[PDB]
Design a protein around this ligand. Structure first.
Ligand SMILES: *[C@@H]1O[C@H](CO)[C@@H](O[C@@H]2O[C@H](CO)[C@@H](O[C@@H]3O[C@H](CO[C@H]4O[C@H](CO)[C@@H](O)[C@H](O)[C@@H]4O)[C@@H](O)[C@H](O[C@H]4O[C@H](CO)[C@@H](O)[C@H](O)[C@@H]4O)[C@@H]3O)[C@H](O)[C@H]2NC(C)=O)[C@H](O)[C@H]1NC(C)=O
Ligand SMILES: *[C@@H]1O[C@H](CO[C@@H]2O[C@@H](C)[C@@H](O)[C@@H](O)[C@@H]2O)[C@@H](O[C@@H]2O[C@H](CO)[C@@H](O)[C@H](O)[C@H]2NC(C)=O)[C@H](O)[C@H]1NC(C)=O
Ligand SMILES: *[C@@H]1O[C@H](CO[C@@H]2O[C@@H](C)[C@@H](O)[C@@H](O)[C@@H]2O)[C@@H](O[C@@H]2O[C@H](CO)[C@@H](O)[C@H](O)[C@H]2NC(C)=O)[C@H](O)[C@H]1NC(C)=O
Ligand SMILES: *[C@@H]1O[C@H](CO[C@@H]2O[C@@H](C)[C@@H](O)[C@@H](O)[C@@H]2O)[C@@H](O)[C@H](O)[C@H]1NC(C)=O
Ligand code: AMP
Ligand code: ZN
Ligand code: ZN
Length: 426
């Protein structure tokens, strides 16, 4: 007779789950036609290679592909308490073939697709470099795009997040279903090489100052943080000595992340359209923070590229009320198979703990895994390189130089450690 909360069973609490989708790149022009240079504007006059209803390797996403990805999520039987969505919705076409209004229209379409299919799911979006017109030129003051996405994403975001989103394209937001968890959605396009608007800016849109204060508040309020953004920190794994964002910004952002590694329980990026791991470590090689780059829904590649990705979406598992990452489940569409029969079969690619025989996704667990990658003829690394393209080509090979670039980028996010890795292993 005392109105005490009803104690749950001693059963093990169910893990929490959330979805990560990225790089949808809708191409509204997509359509099958005899002249394969007219299947999709995103091929920029190239002949589509083998187009079907779910797309082509030289095209961005037909609407039907994006719909099939979200239909899979909806009917997967996986419970999830939120979704993160890390940007890049318009297609790869020349700047004169887009406009601010067209960019906003595509982002609106994607946003409304998600809200229509998932009316009860909190979603945390981030802007990508194509989520602006002209592409990559994301500004350091308020803009029409920033104001538009602030209105589009209002169902998911509180007043303070809406205010910072409108001003600079970034926000933080408490997760309604997960007390003690905060999402920080950065606009890392402010740091991306092609962005003229941020040249010679030490703190464009004051995002570093804001991020510092946000993380400090989370620290003192005993919150955990998941960082989400479009362009990742660290080095491109397919190129030599090339940071994904400008080196000055990479170094500055990584130092913030190292100082707050005790608060940051995950980092989640897109932009590369590949499945990549990174482990942020100190200068002495001690692992600090696990980083997850998710592959795209679009399969697009340029004619000059040999490989591309299969479409992917992924799910993370975490410890409830604690937010330590326990696992990652990567799903994919075999695009050639789907196009041949005309029906999608989104399916499991792998479960990270099972694929790699690791206990969880903590930095030390992943650090020990990637140390195995470095061993000669590592079967773990061969599997990783297969999954890098989302199982596009089991015959794709990574020679000694390719593997040095991959492993060095996985383990060394800052310039000093990355260049030392090249010195030791080239
Ligand atoms: C996603 O879905 C696609 C489509 O089903 C799968 O791709 C097919 O995979 C099978 C098996 O790997 C391929 O069949 C094999 O092809 C080999 C030839 O390689 C290429 O050569 C021709 C050029 O002449 C290409 O056009 C062709 O597409 C291939 O890419 C052959 O050497 C094999 O022959 C022998 O294989 C075994 C031997 O035990 C036997 O089954 C056969 O009888 C034969 O003796 C075999 O035919 C098939 O070609 C692929 N199709 C396409 C369109 O690429 C992907 O594997 C799948 N992805 C994942 C991750 O599962
Ligand atoms: C796009 O492709 C067309 C068609 O090329 C053919 O189509 C394929 C199915 C395959 O069979 C190829 O080997 C063929 O060549 C190209 O147009 C043709 O190109 C050659 C001359 O270079 C010749 O077949 C015809 O003169 C061209 N026209 C047609 C209707 O066949 C076209 O050049 C390709 N465009 C690009 C940008 O690659
Ligand atoms: C989202 O778009 C799809 C795809 O259509 C294109 O995408 C938009 C960005 C915009 O440019 C549209 O004008 C394009 O047609 C829409 O699906 C299509 O909708 C129309 C009906 O209005 C219909 O003619 C098509 O057959 C539909 N299907 C396909 C595969 O194109 C979809 O309705 C849009 N969704 C939202 C919520 O806006
Ligand atoms: C980080 O915050 C420290 C703690 O100060 C208190 O933090 C919360 C509760 C705020 O309400 C603030 O007003 C409090 O004073 C600061 O002492 C410290 O300066 C901050 N560190 C940095 C690097 O900004
Ligand atoms: N694996 C790759 N090889 C060569 N170029 C790439 C690769 N991945 C991405 N790019 C380039 O990076 C950009 C793609 O990012 P985005 O345009 O934001 O989707 C384009 O300029 C591509 O040409
Ligand atoms: Zn992209
Ligand atoms: Zn991008």
């Amino acid at each position: 007779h005392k109105l005490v909360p009803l104690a749950p069973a001693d059963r093990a609490p169910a893990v929490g789950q959330f979805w990560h989708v990225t790089d949808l790149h809708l191409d509204p022009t997509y359509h099958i036609t005899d002249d394969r240079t007219k299947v999709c504007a995103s091929s920029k006059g190239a002949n589509a290679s083998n187009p079907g209803p779910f797309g082509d390797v030289l095209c961005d996403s037909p609407y039907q592909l994006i719909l099939s990805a979200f239909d899979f999520i909806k009917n997967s039987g996986q419970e999830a308490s939120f979704m993160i969505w890390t940007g890049d919705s318009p297609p790869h076409v020349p700047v004169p073939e887009l406009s601010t209004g067209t960019v906003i229209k595509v982002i609106t379409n994607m946003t409304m697709t998600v809200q229509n299919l998932f009316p009860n799911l909190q979603v945390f979006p981030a802007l990508g470099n194509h989520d602006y017109w002209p592409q990559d030129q994301l500004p350091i003051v308020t803009s029409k795009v920033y104001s538009a996405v602030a209105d589009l994403w209002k169902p998911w975001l509180g007043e303070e997040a809406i205010s910072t989103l409108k001003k600079g394209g970034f926000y933080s937001q408490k997760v309604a279903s997960n007390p003690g968890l905060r999402i920080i959605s950065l606009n890392t396009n402010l740091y991306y090489g092609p962005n003229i608007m941020t040249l010679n800016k030490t703190d464009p849109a004051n995002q570093f100052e804001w991020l510092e204060n946000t993380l400090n508040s989370s620290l003192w309020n005993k919150e955990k943080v998941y960082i989400i953004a479009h362009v990742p920190v660290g080095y491109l794994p397919y190129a030599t000595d090339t940071p994904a964002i400008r080196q000055y910004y990479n170094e500055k952002l990584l130092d913030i992340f190292r100082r707050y590694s005790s608060v940051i329980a995950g980092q989640f990026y897109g932009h590369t359209h590949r499945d990549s791991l990174m482990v942020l470590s100190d200068k002495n090689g001690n692992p600090l923070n696990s980083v997850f780059v998710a592959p795209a829904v679009t399969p697009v590649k340029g004619v000059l590229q040999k490989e591309t990705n299969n479409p992917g979406v992924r799910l993370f598992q975490y410890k409830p009320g604690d937010y330590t990452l326990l696992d990652m489940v990567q799903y994919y569409l075999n695009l050639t198979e789907a196009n041949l029969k005309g029906e999608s079969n989104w399916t499991l690619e792998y479960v990270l703990t099972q694929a790699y025989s690791v206990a969880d996704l903590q930095p030390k667990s992943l650090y020990a895994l990637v140390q195995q990658f470095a061993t000669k003829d590592s079967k773990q690394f061969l599997k990783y390189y297969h999954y890098y393209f989302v199982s596009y080509d089991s015959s794709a090979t990574c020679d000694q130089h390719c593997k040095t670039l991959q492993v060095c980028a996985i383990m060394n996010l800052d310039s000093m450690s990355y260049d030392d890795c090249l010195k030791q292993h080239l």
